[PDB]
């Protein structure tokens, strides 16, 4: 109604061709509700585009306001008129089912009058299309003959499709559905759908009786049969519906797999990165390392955590074995890789690994068969990188955007290292080098930058770092494009002279280190300059700078490379020891730049080692949880130089090694953390709010409701973040509106660089938004619409995380959830399977003294308490009940005193079943392992935890409570004095 497309098209038809796109996007309304005076600030074009945008937006705004004021009534009772869009730019189909039957055969049967017949059987695919088999025959006597296409029309009449959410969190009530399609023109199917029982979730079909429904599907129509399942188990479980048609013989039934995940958000934490050099660090040829247990403070109740320890026989072994392989190469980092620079995972790690293995010659024992695989990986990576190449021989950060000098230099540096491996086109690299030298170099010897910055930048210490980086890039292509590009040595000399001229005024550690490495490559690192390089190191162990974490790692890598270029082997071992330590995220490093720089520095150190050898590590692990001692020996010419061990419990152990080498140890733990807003955000301030959509407007047919998610983020630092990323994890059944994201990205305004809906997202669907920068002065806000397709109750909150790519230390996490609780399935049996947990099978209404005595202190039970409720802290996922201990009938593995306080944590689904109240007395007994605290000493209301509401003393005199007060008192006295007979 409010689109008003006709006059929009009319106005656009009266503008020049180049200005049509500028005005077309000036009329469509963005979801953030921005007046076009503010929107014009985001237009990265000329003043003509800004003027046209502003004029068109004001015109259409006034026009549509008048239309909505005149022809819209709130009491009309007549539906608003809808106009067909009648758009242009229509795109033809481009997705067709993949081809099959890619096999060759030779006819060998005895010919009959020249014709040889061969009978071949094929298995038709499950696509409802019409295949066209194409046959071509080759014979040495007659030649090539092309047969006519053969048409195989696959058809079906009744189709059952089972609609499921991607993943439903445990203890979430979700309505999966089965859609039955009838394709008969004038026939009505009479199907008998049935839901098979599954132990994992209590369907409406109990084990005693299966659930069957007879539904009639109208001709040329479809019917949806909704089902409700609540999952109480984790993993992947099968949902099956069996449908049998009447009088049509069709018995089609569809089975699908549903993934159910714990309530929290899975995280990987590093607890130990200790190096292994017993010859020097150890006491006397023996090293002892004490490994503390992981924190696991915020672990989600009833969720197992797995700890893994990895033994490196070489500081470079893990990255090498990861880079050579394909399915594991993507795990070197923990960040997305969808832009210009981050797309170097395919090329740089594999290139460095291949070069290091070649110059060390470890292929004979590692396996020469893998080299071709690595080459293929590099080829694929190179094929991807050409997507970012502008026609002007320059590489841009994103597709079809301003070319970046820094990225072009990095690409040239990586390409110059791979010509000896794969068939890198010389035209591309030479054109990039020529572009860098001609169009971006100032006469003074400084490389200009015009595109928005990607890394961290009188303009001093900014041009120095960029010039040093570009010089390091050019020194790799010195002998490659020397013939196509002539003035390269002059540019290198000018850049080196400029670097030497202003090298004494540097103050930051990063610029000092990078300029020192550039000079050491050029050979000008001599005299007082060398002293400036050495004195910058703090503790003679690192080129550290306060605040920055990954930049410090990169600068230390540059310094180590410079030291190697200086042919020094005394100041290096401390730097190598420090660099092997800073593995914060997972088992390795976070970003790509720091990872690649450490890889390069360590590989260079290993290459120039004076035949170090002496790799005879023998690591003995004394795990308290295991009676038998664990031992691994890693000698030279071993199989993989990597040894991994796994544990299902959190504990601290000790590591013993006997020397003869320099190994590394890394311990990482995997667990789930409760959905709580991060207490302290290092540098980003984030606020995320989800609200119902003011008007339905355009909604997908399947979507049940639409909501608007609005995110506002700001950078608390002095300068804008170099590059930042929004990782948005979404609740069950929710999908974003792709039209809004496309409008945000592709539009002239370009609020977001690009969006990516495809990731691993093993837990829940994730959306990644690449923000070019975050403004420190004011909040940067963006909003888009998310639609729900499956209705859900007790829905868990979603997470939004904003972090700087090149420095992952500065990240902020927030949680959003739509605004007692209401369920959707309370029936005779469905309300009981959900509530079957957190309680015992007793109904707490007909409790007998004998039954209570028998079930009170069963050998499984290890504690029985009589406490009082202090307060109720109801939360989104787990409720907190702080119980004041009144008297402990018996004591177990946990020590308490009268008057002390404890806290019990209960699942949200059991809030109504518990129905606890303020300032009331209760009696609970439970198992021995029902203690959660390691301090807090929290307890979990499990399946063997009893809850009885102790009547108040003044209310014990009523008819409905005197029958129970005396029984409870007698029971308590009997167990206090007489104890348990059994
Ligand atoms: C956590 O670390 C382990 C051990 O290195 C790894 O297998 C796992 O993939 C990592 N994280 C996740 C979220 O799976």
Swiss-Prot record:
Changing residue 361 to A: Impaired binding of C3d to CR2. The record marks 982 as: Coordinates Mg(2+) for interaction with Complement factor B Bb fragment (CFB). The record marks 73-74 as: (Microbial infection) Cleavage. Disulfide bonds join 22-49, 23-56, 36-57, 202-833, 430-481, 681-812, 712-781, 826-831, 838-910, 857-980, 956-965. There is a cross-link at residues 339-342 (Isoglutamyl cysteine thioester (Cys-Gln)). Changing residue 476 to A: Impaired binding of C3d to CR2. Residues 953-978 are annotated as: Interaction with CFP/properdin. Residues 22-57 form the Anaphylatoxin-like domain. Residues 283-302 are annotated as: Disordered. Residues 838-980 form the NTR domain. Glycans are attached at residues 268, 936. The record marks 76-78, 283-284, 626-627, 643-644 as: Cleavage. Changing residue 439 to A: No effect on binding of C3d to CR2. Transmembrane segments: none annotated. This is Complement C3 alpha chain. It comes from Homo sapiens.
